[PDB]
């Protein structure tokens, strides 16, 4: 049953790509002040779950949902900017830059590991196809 490794590692690659994309989106908007609806940008993060249907022992990984990060919104005193609060408290995203950079590095490394898994699995499948010949 080496074919299931294709599904497992492909799901892992897709999930890590989504995680890296979300981390990069958070990082690129660390300095944002406004959203499309006027709301401040809220740092977002993916949720990882075991991609196993009920009764399946072990599977790959899947992104359940994207959730707003739990952290206080960064308050900035700029009661001159057109966007402000009642007391001039501009709300800026709660992005922790170090966390996002480490997340990007971790996602890249896990991605590369899954690529190696896929490569060696394909090599083994070819060798198995050359069983008796």
């Amino acid at each position: 049953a080496l074919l299931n490794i294709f599904d497992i590692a492909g799901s892992a690659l897709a999930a890590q790509s989504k995680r890296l994309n979300v981390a990069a989106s958070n990082l690129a908007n660390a300095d944002s002040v406004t959203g499309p609806d006027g709301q401040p940008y809220r740092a977002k993060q993916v949720v990882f779950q075991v991609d196993a249907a009920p009764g399946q022992a072990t599977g790959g990984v899947k992104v359940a949902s994207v959730i707003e990060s739990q952290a206080p919104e960064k308050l900035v005193y700029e009661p001159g900017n057109p966007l402000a609060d009642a007391n001039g408290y501009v709300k800026m995203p709660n992005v922790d830059v170090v966390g996002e950079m480490v997340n990007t590095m971790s996602a890249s490394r896990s991605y590369q590991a899954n690529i190696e898994v896929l490569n060696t699995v394909k090599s083994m499948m070819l060798k198995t196809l050359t069983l008796g010949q």
Partner: peptide, 16 residues
């Protein structure tokens, strides 16, 4: 039950 991978779940969380 999984959870958020990486920075959020590897930093000391609040007590409750």
């Amino acid at each position: 039950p999984g959870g958020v991978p990486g920075a959020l779940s590897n930093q000391p969380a609040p007590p409750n």
